[model samples]
Target: MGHHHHHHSHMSTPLTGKPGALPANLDDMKVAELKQELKLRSLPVSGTKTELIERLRAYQDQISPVPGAPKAPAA
Candidate 1:
């Protein structure tokens, strides 16, 4: 009985701010927050809204390519 309780306690633990914890709705975040997020990922943070979104999306694609999406070719 005590062993089962220990397992349940581990499963109930709260999470923290880690890599995958980043918000998916980039549009909802302020430019400042986006810049900070870019900095955390060590990506370029100097650009307009469109540029910033493109860069972040590119990085995400590299991490996890979308299913059924045509892969881009190298020049």
Candidate 2:
């Protein structure tokens, strides 16, 4: 069977645990969107700058696009 080789993309500068980096009014935006805003603000929210890697690396990896993958297979 032929499957569509589609992909999904989420763009963000980076995530940083800075003051107002993540909105207190999270209801205004999604976790993904909030993170993007943080990056745009120059906050790299990925790692602690000490850990050298994100605590949620795997979760972020899950957000990255994959070949032939849909935005959400079941969504």
Candidate 3:
């Protein structure tokens, strides 16, 4: 027999956590809107449109898309 234990670890949670304003669709947003969202989260608000989308996606990946649901399983 062996000490087979799965020691799972969680990381990458930033000091600023989620505030439940994540979007269902970030595609339709303009620069102002994107920056507004980032500003509320105290994230860097200086970036391009696509970069803003990416930033939002990065934040979303760490948390659940919706409050009722859990974050999707990692591979």
Candidate 4:
């Protein structure tokens, strides 16, 4: 008898990992509310994930206490 194997991933992050779609708590919050929070806190947000991450890095740089602000290598 032959057996088939399926791939399974155990990643914590939704964007990088799957089970796609937003979390329930976030879904309950209005877009306007989220946007406002992002604006107030100066979070980097964009329509695209790549753009959003770039914006997030910028925000991190400003808030981070590390002198050089070294980020992880892009994969």
- TM-score to native of every candidate shown: 0.57, 0.26, 0.54, 0.30
Candidate topping TM-score: 1
Clashing pairs in 4: none
- Give the per-residue lDDT of model 4 (tens digit) for 25-75: 444444443343344344534455444444445454554565776553322
When summed lDDT is taken over every stretch of 10 residues in candidate 2, the lowest stretch is: 50-59
- For every candidate in turn, the CA RMSD to the true structure comes to 12.3, 16.3, 14.2, 14.8
Model 1 lDDT per residue over 1-75, tens place: 533422223222223222543456777766666665576566678898676766666665655657654333221
Question: Over the stretch 8-60, how does candidate 3's per-residue lDDT look in tens digits?
Answer: 23322233334654665567756766666676565677778888877776666
Specify the highest-lDDT model's number: 3
Number of backbone collisions per candidate, in order?
0, 3, 0, 0
Predicted candidate 2 versus true structure: per-residue lDDT over 1-75, tens digit per residue: 555543226633234443422234444444555554444444456644332123233223345664443232211
Residue 60's C-alpha lDDT in candidate 4? 47
Give the better candidate number (1 or 4) by lDDT.
1
Query: Which pairs of residues collide in model 1?
Result: none
Regions more than 4 Å wrong, model 4: 1-40, 67-75
lDDT of each: 0.56, 0.39, 0.60, 0.41
lDDT of 4 at 17: 25
- Clashing residue pairs in candidate 2 are 15-44, 15-45, 16-45
